[PDB]
Structures are given as structure tokens and as C-alpha cells.
Symmetry: D4
Subunit: 184 residues, 8 copies
Amino acid sequence: GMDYQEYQQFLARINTARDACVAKDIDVDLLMARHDYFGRELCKSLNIEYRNDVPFIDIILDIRPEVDPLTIDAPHITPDNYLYINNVLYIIDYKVSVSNESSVITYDKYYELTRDISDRLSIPIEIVIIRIDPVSRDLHINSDRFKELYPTIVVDINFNQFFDLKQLLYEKFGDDEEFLLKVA
Amino acid sequence: GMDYQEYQQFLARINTARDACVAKDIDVDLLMARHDYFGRELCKSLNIEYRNDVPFIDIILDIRPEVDPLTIDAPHITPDNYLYINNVLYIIDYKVSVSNESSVITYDKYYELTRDISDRLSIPIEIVIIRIDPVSRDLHINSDRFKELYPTIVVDINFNQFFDLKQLLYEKFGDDEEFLLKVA
Amino acid sequence: GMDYQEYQQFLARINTARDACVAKDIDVDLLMARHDYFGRELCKSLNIEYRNDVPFIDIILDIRPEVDPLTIDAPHITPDNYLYINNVLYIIDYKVSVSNESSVITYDKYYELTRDISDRLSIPIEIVIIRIDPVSRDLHINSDRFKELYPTIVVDINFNQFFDLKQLLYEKFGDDEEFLLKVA
Amino acid sequence: GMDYQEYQQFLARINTARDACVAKDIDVDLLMARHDYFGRELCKSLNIEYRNDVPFIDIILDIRPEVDPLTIDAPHITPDNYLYINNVLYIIDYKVSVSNESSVITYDKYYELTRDISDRLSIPIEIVIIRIDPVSRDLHINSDRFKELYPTIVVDINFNQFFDLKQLLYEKFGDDEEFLLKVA
Amino acid sequence: GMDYQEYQQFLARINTARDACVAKDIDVDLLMARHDYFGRELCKSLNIEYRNDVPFIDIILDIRPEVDPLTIDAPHITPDNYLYINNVLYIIDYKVSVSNESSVITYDKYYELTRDISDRLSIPIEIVIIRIDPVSRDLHINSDRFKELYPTIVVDINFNQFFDLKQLLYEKFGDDEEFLLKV
Amino acid sequence: GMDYQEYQQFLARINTARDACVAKDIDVDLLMARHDYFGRELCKSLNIEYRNDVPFIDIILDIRPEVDPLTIDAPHITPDNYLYINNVLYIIDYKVSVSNESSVITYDKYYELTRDISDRLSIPIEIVIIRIDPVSRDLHINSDRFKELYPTIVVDINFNQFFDLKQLLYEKFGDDEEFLLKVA
Amino acid sequence: GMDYQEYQQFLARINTARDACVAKDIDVDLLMARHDYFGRELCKSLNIEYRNDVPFIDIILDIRPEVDPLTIDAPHITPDNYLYINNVLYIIDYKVSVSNESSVITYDKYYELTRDISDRLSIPIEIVIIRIDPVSRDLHINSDRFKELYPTIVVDINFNQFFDLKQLLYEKFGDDEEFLLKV
Amino acid sequence: GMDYQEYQQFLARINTARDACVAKDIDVDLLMARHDYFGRELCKSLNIEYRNDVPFIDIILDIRPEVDPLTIDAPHITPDNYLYINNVLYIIDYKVSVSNESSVITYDKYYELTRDISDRLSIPIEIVIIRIDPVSRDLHINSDRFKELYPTIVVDINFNQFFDLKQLLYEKFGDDEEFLLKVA
Ligand SMILES: [Mn+2]
Ligand SMILES: [Mn+2]
Ligand SMILES: [Mn+2]
Ligand SMILES: [Mn+2]
Ligand SMILES: [Mn+2]
Ligand SMILES: [Mn+2]
Ligand SMILES: [Mn+2]
Ligand SMILES: [Mn+2]
């Protein structure tokens, strides 16, 4: 599961919270911690490095170190991760969601913003959304090419603590209309 | 749970499906059946009539039968249900979702589109989003006024069959990229 | 087929034209004439009145004649035709096209804009796009309900004269770059 | 005509299809197959290599191999084909349509987006839409300059097989409202 | 031509003006005054009432007094003038301009916004843009129906006073970039 | 000055606040309280009933009680107050600001949206923005017509308490970047 | 004034014209011809090279030949003309018009789109709109810097041929609604 | 305070003005002068150069002077000032305002537009809005990092002359309706 310190930090904020805007920031932070928790575990299952916000220009400098970062025409995105194997660049995004809606948004954006640079570099750029459905816990991966490389991916985890914390937050703020209808 | 005939219809479509576009229509139909299943059970818990697409103009004719449907300036919406009690009009929408995003959209639309007609009629119009989180199964109701009227609402149900069917669909179409990234 | 007064005017217009812009106006009028010719012939087959730009408001006054036209909230559309039969209002559009694209546009528009007036009048409003494919000459009608009323409709026509006039036009302007890319 | 394997795959798809959306997908695929058959036959008549979706940057590298693909400021378009001759770049698009509407849309986009790179390279860039009318089978080419380059271009083919497959499709789905009004 | 007082008021405004934004307001006012002058003279030529900003809803109440102005669904526009003759409503706009662009914009808007009220009243509504070219002094009117009604129109005026005033203004402010490019 | 209960509630909110977002909410609430205190004092000086957010339809029913509220075509605006006198309707908005920016925005909206109802009612509708500059304490009123109606209007108040509460808030949160850049 | 052949070509076009859309193309062409005539004469008055559609990237290569046209970040515009003098680039646009509206639109666009390339080259880029009022024949130029360079400009021309041609056109097509309101 | 040459010009402009549009130009210039006066005084307190419209591209050439200005992909902003200290680029904006609204706008804009150039240069870019509240005369700076470098900044000024000039202006144009609602 999630780290004890991390759980306790959430427990403390929820217990201290008295206002809708604070409660909504907790809701949002839980979802991001859940996402990052999956990312870490997924990367351990794949035996790849967990990466800390690598902008696309740095991905390119890593794989083609002769390029000039000051002049290259290159998209401005920061994916969760990437892998360069056998001269294919896999651009990886983690998702934790019961639906694909957020995945389609990310895929379309990344796909469209990377076609030109793929052509300029002569490097195929494969967009890989790795989503886990937090209820079923099944993995859903769009990219057949990526699945060829990793055909048997097992990430044995659950999100029971995020669900518990969220459930606690909504019980504590369940008669605050302002919280119930608050946007992120 | 869900009706056997309804489950079996879903089972049949999933088993016959071979194409991403069909699979996505099933995904969407499951979510609507889940929503309607909650609606029916909720209405039984509240001891109110389950209503079949009543346009707002018909809500007004029901509560103020002297009004002229041909001339009244009135919004064009069709809520899931409504209740007129003690000269308050409660406009009710069901939701089944782990998040409030769809609720905020519906609330803002209904709230904004009903202010003028509320003023024209001199009838307070209260917008009531009744959402059940399908994982926790807790009820979340924005309207304090509605909760005053129904303070102890119990809808003892679950969505295990919708989750099972969806899980089956995603397993069967789990190596179809087109399905995994398909929009409704 | 196309008559005498109309065929002859087209040939005369093609023969005297010398500019791309005049030519394209002919191309456009040919297409409007073809659509109108189909409409007339379809109406002879259905034995219904062929109508001349009757606005929706006039459709209401014909079939619910207590309505006050100064007030009624009615949509601002002018459909090719309409039938009111057994308290169902069918709104009719003619199309001559090898594809359904124009039909979907008209359907979505007419369907959306007639929902509210359907609720006010409590008359269901059925939107019927009647399309003829001018190559196969087969009829395609979306409305199952319309087709129950008129189960075998035979419109035995062809568009050979329109095709011939269009080849005359392209024989004369086929190497005029302005014509070839001129907008409607 | 159309490759025999390709004919047979369409016939099988039609025979095994049961849903409106799969039927529309077959319709759209028939149109793309028809475009591509035309493209293949046209390219034989033009004595150029059959290409589809060429990245514009690849074109620039072919015609000016000393350009640095990492830095050149160039548009992102993927035309069907191209020809570079006597220091003129002809950007070529295949169309199969009874009207010029889609041709105008392609031409306006490609022309607008290549003006700047034409100045930078000091290479005139001529946009050539080559359309065959599938009913008359006449070829219509906008560009005077392209037509002066070539001897009279003749592509003597027909689309009878595509018309026959489409007829089979409508024989099966022509009374399905969802098919009739299905969007691509 | 134009009134003596109106002229003097303009000449005095130009004389005391010292800033671009004031100068530009004068330039705008001269054009509105030109348009209104043309309007008054045209109305004299046609022997019709010169009208002062009538909103469409008041047009409707004039022509169809039984209409309830609280409930009628009607466009919000204010044409320069109108004429109701033989159960036809001519909506009239005056233009003073060397090109038709202004005209096309007013026509398209007035035509589009009046279709529905034409149907509701069962009154044909004809949109008439009467433009005078300030250089040639020729009259251009789009409407055949209106010209059949008035086949012989002579408005024998000129705009020399306006051109002259505009000249003084540009004599004083001609080297001020702020004025030359002021909206 | 400001009611003593209201002062004390602000002071308690400031003292018990710990988060940037709760702090910004207090800031926004101080501004609305300042607006409303001004409104209350101005209304005493104008000898009108203190109102806030009046539905425009209520105004019309007050000034023309024979209007049918169900059918009249009227705008949906909720001004701070209004005055009807000698058949002129003055629509009144309170502002507290050192500049006219928000005043122009309110005036343009209210003026544009009341032209049509002014014609229909045959009642001139004059938009009156009454702004007090919180630093100079001078009153600025756009409408000549409103100012001719009234003897010289004097509202001799100050906003020192609001300035003192704001200072307390910034003493506590002025080194919190999230507060400093927090949006309303 | 304008060339004899050019005149005849126009008069012949009006004579054989019989449709509104052809008539309108003539009206457009007359205005472009007027603008180009003014352009050529202005360039003779200023003793500068009359230029044929130079794109900004070619301007840059003229003035700074060391720039790599494949990589330079530069606006896509095509002004009527330019002048590079004492390491200042004057971007020039000709206008023939009675009002400044056209001018304000071209200025605002040219000014905005050239700021960044001015900084990158370290060259000041001045936008000069040279308008002649076709009625008064007075010249109006926004740019003080340009007028300091050329304080005495006389372009002694008129546009009577264009007005006359425009008159024939409106004589033949003056009762065609389609033409009067054609875009 | 404000000097002699500048104070005197303002008084002269106010004294000779007689039109709303001239008056508002004065109001606007007063506000620009006040902002510039604060900038100058702040820069004296920090002992840094007060800069005059230095474009971002020039900021790059000053601090990474190998950059080619003809090519660098750099944002098109002109901040009030900048410091480059210990390989951190601080981008500085002055504000004089009782609220943070204008500061949030500038922050979000400058932050967004500098992300990509930060990655290319591998220099973090810190956005610093320095706001003075002209009533309290307190300084509010969002950047914790900037405030570590300059831990006690004292800008001992007031805006009394600007306030006095603005009252002269309102004394003279306070009953001119055009002035009162005139836009910048
Ligand atoms: Mn992610
Ligand atoms: Mn619902
Ligand atoms: Mn039709
Ligand atoms: Mn193509
Ligand atoms: Mn007018
Ligand atoms: Mn207010
Ligand atoms: Mn020009
Ligand atoms: Mn600033």
C-alpha cells in the first residue's frame, strides 16, 4: 500500500479541514497521490526507472545528445515517463480511472504534438497510456507495440486506502453543498 | 440487483460483439442502465413515482394547470424527476459516479436555466442532484432543503453486475486499441 | 424528366456563358433544379401537395389553428414539406445525394429545433429525410414510422438531363482554373 | 479493377456485419479503398511512385538533401503525393468525387500552409488536386501548370465494383435508421 | 446645403480643438451630420415623414395597432425610416458612401432579423438601402419593389461643406500620428 | 460603521484560518461586506428600501402590476436596487472602487439588456451606477438625470474597519505565495 | 493618368459584361488598378524602386544577407514596398481611401507582427502607411520618422479615369439588385 | 516623491483640458506614472538597474550570450525587469494595486510562456510580482525565493501627489457623464 507517512498526512488534513475549498484540494491531492502510487509500483513491475518530470526536450537530448536544445523544433510536453528501445521512443502516461475519457484526451494531445518531431528525428514515437481501473484492478494498455515488449505485466496493488480516505472526506463534508458542487 | 433479462441482454451483446464501435455502445448502455437502475431503487426508497421523461413544460402544467403551454417563457430541460411539496418545486437528477464532475455540469445548467421561471411563477426552484458513489455506495445530496424533507434515505443496492459486465467487455476488447481510445 | 421551359433555359445559359462565376451559378442552379425535380416527382408518387417555402410557424397555424402567431414560440425553419396524419406531424426534407452527410446535418438541426414545440403542442414531431441516390436511383428514408404509412413508394425517375447539362458545362469550363475551384 | 482479395474481404465484412456502426465503417472503408485504387492507377499514368500521406519534411529532404531537418521552419501536412521537376514542387492530392467541395477545402489548406516554405526555399509550390468524377469518369485537374507539364493524362478505370459492394451494404442495412443517419 | 449654425458650430469646434481624440470626434460627427442631412433631403424628395430613431417594436405598433407590445416576438433594431403602403413594410436605411460594403452589412442583418416577424404578421418586409455616392451624387437603391413605387427620385444636393470642413480638420491635425490612426 | 457582530465574526474567521484559500475567501467576503455596508448607508441617504439582487421581473410587476409575468418578454438581470418616479425607471447598482472599470462593465451590460423592455413598456430606463471611492470617500454617479432628481447626495462614511481587517489578514498570510496569487 | 491600353481593356470589359458577378469583378479590379497606379506614381515622386510583392523573408535577406532563410523566425507578410536607410527598415503600404479605417487595420497588423523580428535583428522597423484621399488628392502619412526623411512629397495625379469607368459600370448595372449588394 | 518636470506637466494638462477624452488620457497617464515611480523607487531600494522595455530575447542574449538571436525560440514578453543571480533568472513585474487581480493575470501569462525556454536553457525561471498596495503602502511579493535574497526591502514612499492630481481631475470632470464611464 501507500506509505504510512503519506496516509497520516492525509488523515491530518481531513481531520483539520473545516472549509469546502480545503476539502476539495484534499480530494484532488488524493487522486494525484493515487496516480503517483500506481506509477511507482508500475515502474517496479516493469523494471524501469521512475522518472521525475522530464520535459520532452530532455527526452530528445537523452536519446540524440548531438541535438541543439536551443534550436530544435520540439513539442512542449512533460510525460510521466519514456523508454527508448531498439530505436523506438515510447512516451508513457499513467492513469488511474474507471473510464478512458482522460486517456483519450492525453493520447490525442501527445499523438498530435509528436508527429512532426517523429518525422524530423526519423524515430517512431509510440504513445502509451497505461491505465489501471481502480475497482477491477485490471491493466488497460492501448499500445500493441508496447505490449509485445512487455506481454505479461502484473502490478498487484490496490487503492483501498485512497477509497477509505475519500470516503471519510465525503462523510465529514456530506452536508456542505459548497463542497459537494466544488470544481478543482 | 438488475433484472435477469437485462443482464442476459448485455451478456448476449458482449458475446456477439466483434468491433470496437459496438463494444463502446455497450459500455455506454451499461452506464445508462446503471443510472436507471439506481433511479428506480431510489424512487422506491423515497416512496415517489418513477417518472418517464417529463419535459419542464409538463412539470409546470402539472403544478400550475392554468398556465398556457403555448405562451409560457420556460426552459427546455428534461430532468430525471421532480416533486412539488409545500409550494416548493424540487427538480431531481440521478447520478451514479465516483466523482462530482458530471453533477456540477448538470447543477449549473439546471440552476441557471430555472432562475427566471422561478421568478415568473413565484415558486422557489430547488435543484437536487442525488448521486451514489458506486464503489462506496454512499449517497451524496447537495440540497439541504431536500435533506430536511428526507433526512434518512437508505438505498441498499450494489452495482456488482455492471462492474462484472464492464470488466468482461474490457477483457474481451483489451487488445483492441481502437476500443480502448474510443469516444462515446 | 425535366420539362421544356427549364431544360432549354439551362442550355441557353451554358451556351452564352464565358466566365467562371456565371458557370458556377449554373452548376449551383442545376443542383437546385434537380432537388426540386425530385421533390415534385416524389410528391406525385405520394399523392401529396408539393409545398413552396412554408415556414414552420405557418405549419402550426395550419394544424392547430387556435395558436396565436404573434406569440407562439416556434422554431425558425422552412422544411421542404410536411404531413399531419393521425395527430403525428412529419417534417419532410428532400435530398439528392450519394451520401448521407447532408442528411445528417439537416436531421440533427430539425430534430433539435423541434423538441420544445413538440412538448408545447403535445404533438410528436417526426423528422423524415427522403434521399434519392442519383446513381442507383434508390430511395433511402430514415423514418420507420413514415415508411409504415407509405410502405412501397416508387419514384421512377432519372437525372440524365442534369448529368448531360453538367458535362456540357465541364466541356466548356473544364480548363478554367477559376471554375474548377469556385465556391457555390 | 479492384484487387480480388480486397473485393472478397469487403464481401465477407458485409455478410458478417449485423450493426449499423459496423456497416457505416464498411461504407467509409469502401470510399477510402476507392480513393486509393484511383491513386494507384493515376500514379501509373503519371509515372510516379505510389505514395500516400508523405510527411512534408520528407519531401523537403528529398528535394534539398542539405536542409537540417531538426531546424527548418516548415508546415506539417501529409499530402498524397508530390513531384519535383525543373525546380517546381507539385504537391498532389487524389480525389474521387462528383463535386469540387472537398477539393476546394484541401486546396485552400495546402496553399495557405505552403506559402512561407515556398519563399524560404525559393521553390514555387503548386497545389494540384486531381479529381476523378466517379459517375462520368472524367479527370479534373485545377493546375494549368501541372497540365502543361504532362501529355494529356488518361486514367481509364471505373468504380462498378465499389458501387456493387455499396449496393449489397444498403440491401442489408437500408431500412436501419441508425445506419441511414450514421456519421463516419 | 447644410444649416448655417451647424456649419459654424463645426468650424468653431475645429478651431478650438488641440488634441487628437477631440479631432477624431469631430470627424465622426461630420459623417453623422452628412448622413442625417442626406436623410432629411431624401425624405423631402420622396415626400415622406423624416423619422427620429423608431425602434422596430414601435413600427409594428404603428402598422398593426392591435399587437400587444409586451408579448410580441420581434427584432430589436432601429432603422432610419420606414414606409407601410398597401400592406407592405419597407424598412429604410440611408447611406452616404462610395462603396456598397456598409450597405451589404446593414441589408444582411435587417433581412435576416425580419424574416420571422414577416411570417408572424403575414406582412412582406422589404429592406431598402438608399445610398448616395458622395462624389458622383448618384443614388443607388437595391430594392426593385421600392423603385417601382418611386421610379423617379431626384435629390439635388452636394456635400462640399462637409468635404471643406474635413479639409480644415486635416490641415490642423495632418501631422499628428495619433489622429491619423485614431479609431 | 460596520455592525459590531459582523466585525467580530470576521476577526474570528481570520484568527482561526490556516489555509490560503480560506484566507482569500475572507478577503472576498470583506469586499462584499464593504459593498453591502455602502449600499445600506446609501439607501438611507436616498430614502429607498434597501434591496440587493432584485429580479427584474419583480421590478416590472411593481411598476406595472397588470403585466402577465408568465408571458412578458423581459431581461434576466438582478440589480442592487431601483427607483420608479415620474414614469422613469432608474436601475441602480452600488460600487465601492477606486476606479471605474467594473462600473463600465455593469453599465454596458444593464444598458444593452434593458433597451428592448424600455421600448415595450414605453418607460425610459436609466442605468445609475453609484460608486464611492474608498480612499477619497467621494461619490461618483454617472447619471445626470438621477443627479437632477435628487438634492446633493451625501453618504459620509468610511471603510477604516474593512482596511483594518484586511491588514490583519495580510499580517497572517502575506508571506504565503498561494494566498498572494489566489484567485477569488 | 492611367495607361491607354489599360483604360481600353476596362471599357471593353464593361461593354461585354452582362452578369452581376462579372460586373463586380470589374469594380474590384478598378480599385486594385487605382491602388497600383497610385503606388507607381508615389514611387516616382519619392525616387524609390517600385516593388512587385516582396515577402518579408526576402526583405530580410536583402537587408541582412547573412541570415539563413531556412531557420529565421520571421513573419509572413507581403507589404507593398520597403526602404532600408541608415539601418532603419521602413515597411510601406499604399492606400487610396477617403477614411483611415483600412490604414488602421494594416498598421496594427504590420506593427504587431514585426516587433519580434525587429528585436531579433536589432533593427528598428517603422510601419509607414501612405494614403492618398482620392477626392482632395491630399497625402496622409502616419510616420513622422518617414516624413522627416521625405518632408516634401508631391504626387500630382488624379483618379478621374477610374471614377468615369466606375460610372459606366453603374450605368449598366445600376438596376441590378444582385450587383448593388454583391460582395 | 514625483519630481518637478513631471508633476508640473500633469497640473498643466489638467488645467487646460476641457474634454472627457483628454481627461481620461490624463487619468491613464497618471496611473502609468505611478507605476513607473514605484518601479524606480523599488530599484533604488534593491540597488538594481531600473530597465527600459528590455524584451525577453534581449534578456537571453545578456545572460547566455552564445545564443543566436535569429533562431532562439523565445517568448514574446517584455517584463518590467529581471535579475540573473546564482544561475536563477528572476523575471520581475511591478504592480501598484489594492488587489491581486492584475498580478495573477501577469503571473499566469509569464509563468506559462517561460516554461519551454527554461527547459531549453536549463535555467529555472522564477516569476516575481512585486506589488505595492498604495493605501497601506505595504509590499507584497509572491516569490519566497526572491525574498530569501532580499529579506527586508524598504520602499518608503507614498502616492499622495498622484491622489491629489486625480482629485483635481475629478473636481473638474466629476459631472461629465462621458468621463465617468470612459474606457482607458
Ligand atoms: Mn498520468
Ligand atoms: Mn441523471
Ligand atoms: Mn431538401
Ligand atoms: Mn486525397
Ligand atoms: Mn443609415
Ligand atoms: Mn453593486
Ligand atoms: Mn496597399
Ligand atoms: Mn508592471
